Amino acid sequence: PYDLNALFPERISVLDSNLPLPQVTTVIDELGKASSKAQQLPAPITSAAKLQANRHHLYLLKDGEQNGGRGVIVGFLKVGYKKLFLLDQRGAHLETEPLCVLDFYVTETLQRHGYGSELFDFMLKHKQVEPAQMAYDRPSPKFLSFLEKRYDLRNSVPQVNNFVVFAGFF
Ligand SMILES: CC(=O)SCCNC(=O)CCNC(=O)[C@H](O)C(C)(C)COP(=O)(O)OP(=O)(O)OC[C@H]1O[C@@H](n2cnc3c(N)ncnc32)[C@H](O)[C@@H]1OP(=O)(O)O
């Protein structure tokens, strides 16, 4: 119906909770399903409806050249604040409300071409945050390698919930 380059003129677009709407819905839903399948999750953790219902922020990377220059969304990164009880390196149990990575996916055939990096760098600047100051919801092996090799985040501080944080968090 619309070319994506017309809906999203920027290479990386930011959506809050405000999502023409049916086309935007389809794009986000398909990407969310792809991410959850990649992670062997029982259901999508990212969808258009969930975006509308939550206070999350979704970054979408568009390859403007694809589909005869009409554009295709090739990856997304979803972040949001979560209230968390966390343990520091000495075992002090601290209440915190960090910005968290909640979902993150680049189309499998397009991985390892820097798209994840572009999304993550854009978000850090946009949110005015450094990677060590964030929490990570159940990060996968691929994402942990990404964080170690590109952002020097290694040897996380063990938590009892499913969130991961690194030394510089504290
Ligand atoms: C909290 C959560 O969101 S948990 C869910 C995380 N998402 C997933 O597991 C979904 C499946 N995985 C993905 O979609 C991707 O692997 C992502 C989004 C994590 C990374 O996106 P990509 O576009 O592939 O990352 P990008 O190309 O920018 O990689 C940057 C660096 O990260 C490291 N890296 C990325 N993938 C890997 C990997 N599979 N193995 C080892 N290192 C990797 C490399 O150092 C890479 O640089 P190099 O390619 O020059 O070696």
HEC secondary structure over the chain: CCCHHHHCCCCEEEECCCCCHHHHHHHHHHHHHHHHHHCCCCCCCCCHHHHHHCCCEEEEEEECCHHHHCCEEEEEEEEEECCEEEECCCCCEEEECCEEEEEEEECHHHCCCCHHHHHHHHHHHHHCCCHHHCEEECCCHHHHHHHHHHHCCCCCECCCCCEEECHHHC
Closest CA to 15 of 54, 62, 60: 60
User: 119 with 14: CB under 8 angstroms?
Assistant: no
- From CA 161, how far away is CA 138, in angstroms rounded? 9
Closest CA to 138 of 41, 7, 20, 14: 41
User: Residue 83 is encoded by which pair of tokens?
Assistant: 């209230």
Closest CA to 115 of 26, 28, 11, 40: 11
**The one-letter amino acid at 65:** E
Closest CA to 82 of 138, 145, 156: 138
Report the pocket of ligand 1 as residue ranges, CB < 6 Å: 35, 38-39, 101, 103-106, 111-117, 136-140, 142-143, 145-146, 149-150
- From CA 108, how far away is CA 116, in angstroms rounded? 11
- Interhelix angle 141-151/115-127, rounded to 10 degrees, is 70
User: Residue 133 is encoded by which pair of tokens?
Assistant: 């100051």
- From CA 21, how far away is CA 52, in angstroms rounded? 12
Buried b (16+ CB within 10 A) or exposed e, 43-72: ebbbbbebbbeeebbbbbbbbbeeeeeebb
Domains of the chain: 1-170 (3.40.630.30)
Determine the distance separating the centroid of ligand 1 and the alpha carbon of 60, expressed in angstroms: 16
- From CA 101, how far away is CA 41, in angstroms rounded? 16
Resolution at which this structure was determined, Å: 1.7
Determine the distance separating the centroid of ligand 1 and the alpha carbon of 140, expressed in angstroms: 9
Burial zone of 156 (CB within 10 Å; 0-12 exposed, 13-18 middle, 19+ buried):
middle
Closest CA to 11 of 50, 52, 87, 65: 65
Breaks (C-N over 2.5 A) in the chain follow: 19
Mutate to test the pocket of ligand 1, among 58, 111, 118, 156 (most ligand atoms within 8 A of CB): 111
Mutate to test the pocket of ligand 1, among 102, 144, 146, 161 (most ligand atoms within 8 A of CB): 146
Determine the distance separating the centroid of ligand 1 and the alpha carbon of 54, expressed in angstroms: 26
- Total Cβ atoms within 10 A of residue 22: 9
